[PDB]
Amino acid sequence: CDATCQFRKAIDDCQKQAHHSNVLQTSVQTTATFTSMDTSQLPGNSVFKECMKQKKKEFKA
Amino acid sequence: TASIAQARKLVEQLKMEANIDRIKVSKAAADLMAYCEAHAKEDPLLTPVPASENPFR
Amino acid sequence: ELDQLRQEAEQLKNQIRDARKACADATLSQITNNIDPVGRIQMRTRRTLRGHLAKIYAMHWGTDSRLLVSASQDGKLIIWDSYTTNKVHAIPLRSSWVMTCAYAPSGNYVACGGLDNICSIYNLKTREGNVRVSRELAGHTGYLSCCRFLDDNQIVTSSGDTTCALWDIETGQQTTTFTGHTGDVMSLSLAPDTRLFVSGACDASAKLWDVREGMCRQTFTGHESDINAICFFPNGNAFATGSDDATCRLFDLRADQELMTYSHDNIICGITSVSFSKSGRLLLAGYDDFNCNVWDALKADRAGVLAGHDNRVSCLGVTDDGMAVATGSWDSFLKIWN
Amino acid sequence: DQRNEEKAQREANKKIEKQLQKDKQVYRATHRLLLLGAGESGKNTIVKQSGIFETKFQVDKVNFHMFDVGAQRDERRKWIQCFNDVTAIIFVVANRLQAALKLFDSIWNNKWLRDTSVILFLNKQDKSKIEDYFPEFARYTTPEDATPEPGEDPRVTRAKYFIRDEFLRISTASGDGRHYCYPHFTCAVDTENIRRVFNDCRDIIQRMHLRQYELL
Amino acid sequence: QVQLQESGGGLVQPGGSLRLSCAASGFTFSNYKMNWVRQAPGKGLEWVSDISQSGASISYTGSVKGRFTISRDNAKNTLYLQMNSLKPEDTAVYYCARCPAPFTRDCFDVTSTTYAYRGQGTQVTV
Amino acid sequence: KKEQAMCLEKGCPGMWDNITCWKPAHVGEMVLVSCPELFRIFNPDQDMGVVSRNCTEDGWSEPFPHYFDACGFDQDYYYLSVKALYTVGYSLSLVALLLAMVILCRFRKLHCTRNFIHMNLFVSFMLRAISVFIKDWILYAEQDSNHCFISTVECKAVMVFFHYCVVSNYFWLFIEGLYLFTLLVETFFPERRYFYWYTIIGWGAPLVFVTVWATLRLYFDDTGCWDMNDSTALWWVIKGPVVGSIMVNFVLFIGIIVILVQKLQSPDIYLRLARSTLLLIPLFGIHYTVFAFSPENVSKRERLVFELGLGSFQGFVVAVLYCFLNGEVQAEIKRKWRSWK
């Protein structure tokens, strides 16, 4: 189950990185008055896309 | 007349300074040195005060 | 006529001068050499009194060791309870520049004066309620710099017109008038037997008076500048002066010359007010460099510093029982030390 | 009993404290002005509106308090000292001139009067008197950067600018900027001399605040 | 004790030259700023000259500019004044005065009503 | 496993390998299934990928085509620096603000109504810098744990306290400029009267402007725990009077300068007007004005290091311009130091 178990490891370890990364982003962004943070400018959704590029490359090892 | 009127003052009022005694100052100083040690227990600021006696707590 | 009159007087000066040296036998510092000092003994601010706006120029203590009076250029006399720090009374004034104030030893009258050339007498019995002015004593031309009380009927005042003038309140006129000095008369203190007094003047001199005779008794000149602070020893035999050149001195009323000086090279401003401890050992004085100074009288050594103030002080005094010492200063603040 | 007075004194003290709070602020309503000099006619033409004379007036709902000394003795070194709370000293001129310099100068170098400002008033429109006094008056250029009073002989206006610049080489001679002089000539004119004070007390109390914020 | 004695005065025809030392004692002379004053017969007094504590600052009345010089000898507490190139309108009773306080340059001493620190006087006849 | 619960409840039996719920199958059925719903918004709706896996007699075969065929398609170093930038900035302000507050408690020579404004400004920077320390590290430590959004009840009290302390802070700079400008507007001033009607408009109207934003968004839109914005208007309930103070406080900064230059050109400059203006900026918050008047998401987005860092150390610069490098406090802490021995 080198893929099918790791695909459960694909989704959770990146959500553990993506949701880690946007609440990192909102933290520094919400301590600013004029540059406030909206969900349309949320990272993580694009970090989940850049997750599986390298994660599809450890499948080839 | 007017300038000699108050010039007259320093003639007589200087003269009455000469009539005053010359007590020697050392025995005149020991009168002070007796006076401090005589009342040396009744001074509230020479010896510091306990909190019962002091009306300023 | 005048050239001989100056000629006899400088010989009459030397007639007194070298004959003054005939009792110059030793020094005071030679003969207090055995006593231990009081040591570094320091007081503490017990209370602090805040009602005034302008600079508190003069205060005066009470005879009960309970109350005191104070006045400042805003134009308010205020009687402070020393114990609870509760103000007993407040009085408006018609002038503003009250240069001095006084508190009678009956406790039924207070008084003040200043550049208005008028020594107001205020009533504290007050059968109708609040206080009111009894009368005022307009017989002067200069200003009034100090005033004191003999009883509830006659007061002695200082002068900006050179003449200390004792009054009588029912007459409202000067019984006597002392025309001895040359410049301005700043301060005067009453004797412990209310019979004589001395007056510090603006010509480095002080002339002992008499309130009955009206003559000029003595004259003490040892200062280099004008005198501002002068007060009696408690026994009635000495008085200690302070001029505007940071020199505190000591004289005697029998030896008729000076005894002991008080100075230090780190003090450059002038002396403003002076007082004495109850047992007469400690001498207390304030300065223009914003802090008080407590001296031994005998060794001529500073022993206490009361540095709570942060403007120049102008008035202080130790109470009649010696229980505490209170100071005032130009920041409108009254610090009571113990 | 013992606390029978504790309902008196506290309720007497708070009568006093409530009384003085009208007077703590009405002290700040007015501005004290010490008016002095050595003369009569220039000194009693600003009486247009004892021991010490006292007047009071208000302009633009702001009230003043002039205190000209009357029956006082000519030695000044001890009743000057009670006058450092004043917002501004008005100094009036009226060989009086050179002797009037040190009466201004020793004010300016006084230890207790270092923090208070000095207004000025030039009376006595004098020509033979000035070069009799000062030799280097003949070297003087009239200031053209200063506008003259229009319609006058240029020797009349020139001596006017000699003494006005003579005080200023004493006033600004190491003054360090804690207090500022304010030279004005209104020689016996039936005019305001009020707005020429009301504007110039305002410049005093303006520059105190910028001094407190370390901006001057 | 405040004793401000002098040495001088005399007859001068206009163009002469003469000195004045004001010898005085009773206090620390180095702590005081010293100054002279005259008075014409019929007029008041007027300040003519001074010196500072160290001797640095020197000033004069305009009508006597460049004809008098003023110095001191602080070692033996004198006050030297040199009068050169005399003028006929300078006959007046002079004095030798002291400013009241020490350590500060402020002075209020020109007054008539027995200022306590002016000398016994001199007299010049030009 | 909510999907498994709604999947398990509804050849081969039903098997859930945590990707897809395999239905109860037969031998050799080519089961053509698709990627789950988490890839629907990544691509547009034309790229719904399908995979296959045969259930044989031995259970299920290998999944072919594989999951990465169908389900297919750094700022972490940057933000932990910038987060470390203000937390070393707001801290080093605060410990140097306690050391500026505790000077202004005691001495009572300095107790004038000037300094009574400044303590009421210094408590705002204590309230701003504490409003991100022990609240913006404990709502985003719980979001850090949950791997989702929390939306608790105490996430308000972290967030609504943050939108009260800061909206007061833009008032107490504006009051600071107003009080000095009204100190140069006239001659007569009721001086204690103008102050008491300032400490209630710099603490009270901040509180009315945060409680309306609370009460018009609780009734309208509670999204998570009140942190994201997603509106266009109700930020200008909060940022309106934030910009509105900054709009007029720059104008009040000019009126000081036109008065100061009028006193500066007297009978008896460019270095004096230099050090006055620079010392007047961080008391007034005019270093904020460029950010306030500039658009955010078009011009540049990574000038937060230039925007937070100027805002972060502002508590430190005010306590070294108005409390430590003061020319009278320094000559008063000197004099009490002479009274230690």
Residue numbers in the entry:
A (entry chain B): 1 to 61
B (entry chain D): 6 to 62
C (entry chain E): 3 to 340
D (entry chain F): 11 to 59, 205 to 249, 264 to 295, 305 to 394
E (entry chain C): 1 to 126
F (entry chain A): 28 to 37, 53 to 88, 110 to 136, 145 to 339, 347 to 419
Verbatim from the authors:
The receptors that recognize PACAP are characterized into three distinct subtypes based on their relative affinities to PACAP and VIP: the pituitary adenylate cyclase-activating polypeptide type I receptor (PAC1R) with two orders of magnitude higher affinity to PACAP than to VIP; the vasoactive intestinal polypeptide receptor 1 (VPACR1) and receptor 2 (VPACR2) with similar PACAP/VIP affinities.
Despite the low sequence homology between maxadilan and PACAP38, they both potently activate PAC1R. In the maxadilan-PAC1R-Gs structure, PAC1R ECD adopts a dramatically different conformation from that of the PACAP38-PAC1R-Gs structure, but intriguingly utilize the same interface for maxadilan binding.
